[PDB]
Chains A and B, each alone.
Chain A
Amino acid sequence: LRVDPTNDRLSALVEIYRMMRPGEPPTREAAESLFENLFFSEDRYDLSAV
């Protein structure tokens, strides 16, 4: 947490969006969509029964 430069969801989304795609000005909606589709999209992320 000390190392963390962010303190809110929006800046975390910005950092995630910039690390996943270099540059790429962090549009808030784009960052939210990227984060949701990375791990919470059934058509983009799945673990299956196993």
Chain B
Amino acid sequence: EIGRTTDPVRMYMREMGTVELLTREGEIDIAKRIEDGINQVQCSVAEYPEAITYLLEQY
């Protein structure tokens, strides 16, 4: 905080204090939205032919 501080440790703790801890199912929900995003990007790559041609070349 603004306490005439000059230690990066202190305000790093300040930064980490803003975000609240997660639960077991919270991690699963966040990973689920991550999986939705990666499936979206996989579909986007899917609609692109040339990347698939390159993948088939390596196969």
Contact = CB atoms under 8 A, between A and B. Distances in A.
The answer to whether A and B touch in the complex, with CB atoms under 8 Å apart, is: yes
Interface residues of B, number: 11
B24 interface: no
A25 B17 contact: yes
Interface of A is mostly: loop
Contacts, number: 22
A22 B2 CA distance: 9
Contacts of B10: 21-24
Contacts of B11: 23
Interface residues of A, number: 6
A23 to B, nearest CB: 4
A26 to B, nearest CB: 10
Nearest to B7: A22
B33 interface: no
